[PDB]
Design goal:
Chain B: It comes from Homo sapiens. The structure is cut from a larger assembly and holds chains A (49 residues) and B (54 residues). By secondary structure, chain A is mostly helical. Helix content of chain A is 29%, strand content 0%. In chain A, 0% of the residues are buried. With 54 residues, chain B is mainly alpha-helical. The longest helix of chain B is centred in the middle third of the chain and has 33 residues. The radius of gyration of chain B is 28 Å and the shape is rod-shaped. Classes of the chains: A mainly alpha (49), B mainly alpha (54). Chains A and B meet through helix 1 of A and helix 1 of B.
């Protein structure tokens, strides 16, 4: 059984192997725009008294 | 000594004892060599904020 033990260890050491992927994340970004931007206007002839 | 014990118990336990211990061990061997697996996502966020006009 010393032989078997050694065999266990050898097989165990040799055998193991794997690879995995992980992806830690979380999307947190804040885009804040307040009073600032433009709309649009048409053309109209105006005049004030 | 473990070998001695196993063999001894095997003998008391008879042939049937031997067979399934062999299969368990074989299964173990298969386990150790074979292990592999992976999981993944496609991380995309996105949420919906629905607002009704008033």
């Amino acid at each position: 059984l010393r032989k078997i033990r050694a065999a266990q260890n050898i097989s165990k050491t040799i055998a193991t192997s794997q690879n995995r992927i992980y992806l830690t994340a979380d999307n947190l970004v804040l885009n804040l725009q307040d009073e600032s931007f433009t709309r649009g206007s048409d053309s109209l002839i105006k005049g004030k008294k | 000594k473990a070998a001695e014990l196993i063999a001894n118990s095997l003998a008391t336990a008879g042939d049937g004892l031997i067979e399934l211990r062999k299969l368990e061990a074989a299964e173990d061997i298969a386990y150790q060599l074979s292990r592999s697996r992976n999981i993944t996502y496609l991380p995309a966020g996105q949420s919906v904020l629905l607002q009704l006009p008033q």
